[PDB]
């Protein structure tokens, strides 16, 4: 199961890059595919983009912890 991360707007320009440039790198590094979503947070704020870190577990939670590496912090597990 594809899991979902609350992603501030205003850091898609490090993790994301410009167009989802630094997240696909992370894909590369673990195996699942970090996808920017159009899900509406449980908070529905547009400044909290929700990231689909799709893929299997093993890979998913590998590729948290490089974002989390990104951020330098903790991402909530959100669906």
Do not use: W, Y
């Amino acid at each position: 199961g594809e899991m979902t991360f609350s992603i501030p707007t205003h850091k898609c320009g490090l993790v994301i890059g410009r167009g989802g440039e630094n997240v696909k790198a992370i894909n590369q590094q673990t195996g699942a595919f970090v996808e920017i979503s159009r899900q509406l947070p449980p908070n529905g704020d547009p400044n909290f983009k929700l990231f689909i870190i799709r893929g299997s577990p093993q890979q998913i939670d590998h590729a948290k912890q490089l974002i989390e590496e990104k951020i330098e912090g903790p991402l909530c597990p959100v669906g």
